[PDB]
Amino acid sequence: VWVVGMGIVMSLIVLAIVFGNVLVITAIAKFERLQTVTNYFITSLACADLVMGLAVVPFGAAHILTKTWTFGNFWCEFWTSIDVLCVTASIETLCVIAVDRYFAITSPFKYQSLLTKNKARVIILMVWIVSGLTSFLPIQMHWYRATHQEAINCYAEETCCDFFTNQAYAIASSIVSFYVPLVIMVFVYSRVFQEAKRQLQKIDKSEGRHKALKTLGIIMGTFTLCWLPFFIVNIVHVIQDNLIRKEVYILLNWIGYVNSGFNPLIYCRSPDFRIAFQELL
Ligand SMILES: CN[C@@H]1CCc2c(ccc(O)c2O)[C@H]1O
């Protein structure tokens, strides 16, 4: 009396992610005024989110509902690799956008020289290749395999699908994918807030006779609340085995998936971009 219910919610999640990614991609592609050096990063992020929504979510949904993975083992390895790739690519694109905003605000005179049309494609390709090398190489080549009896029993079984890793690989993946971008974003947005406060004081210095907090708070809080608990649990269950069950792990992982859905809504809100929506519909 509960299978017919959660399926509807998961289908709505899939539809929302697909629609949110596709609308942004087509709006940027087919409209002349929208093209900008800063909009290419948004295009890369939208592509990563679309790949996530198209590939990762439905297969995991089917696996959760029917409780039996009705495909091979090569397919499950590929699915895990694609999931890791998409997650790390999304996070690194976020940190790249934050760094670009810092460069734009802190140094306005030299902003043109630092970033150009040629230098953005190279950065995007570098981000994508480092994201790909972190996931496919250690997974597709069986270098992350564990040494537990339950782990080998699960690995030998064809139908059963589950995730087991050694502690070292979990630590390395978490460090590469989450912590460093978070530190970079924190420093960037602290500096941006300081600059905004300084300008706000400077204006009221002469023009005699808030919003920055709202914007920075929403931008940081959405990402931090969506993704922070999952990586803490990721470290914890491999440092100590008894603490974390297999259901809390899945729930906290699935919490982070919805972040890709909200990202186009929070990042793309420019008035010209809404005008671009207006023409489409
Ligand atoms: C299938 N779930 C995976 C399992 C581990 C993992 C994820 C995402 C990023 C990482 O760096 C990881 O190590 C999760 O999406």
Key traits:
281 residues, mainly alpha, 10 helices, binds the ligand CN[C@@H]1CCc2c(ccc(O)c2O)[C@H]1O, signaling protein, Receptor, G protein, monomeric, Beta-2 adrenergic receptor
What would your notes on this structure say?
The chain crosses the membrane at residues 5-28, 42-65, 77-99, 121-144, 167-190, 216-239, 247-270. One of its GO terms (cellular component) is plasma membrane. This is Beta-2 adrenergic receptor. Disulfide bonds join 76-161, 154-160. This protein has one domain: Rhopdopsin 7-helix transmembrane proteins, CATH 1.20.1070. It starts with a helix and ends with a helix. The chain has helices spanning 3-30, 39-66, 74-106, 111-114, 117-140, 149-156, 167-206, 211-239, 246-267, 271-280. It is mostly helical. The structure holds ligand G1I. The ligand CN[C@@H]1CCc2c(ccc(O)c2O)[C@H]1O binds next to helix 3 and helix 7.
Summarize the structure.
With 281 residues, this protein is mostly helical. The chain has one domain: Rhopdopsin 7-helix transmembrane proteins, CATH 1.20.1070.10.
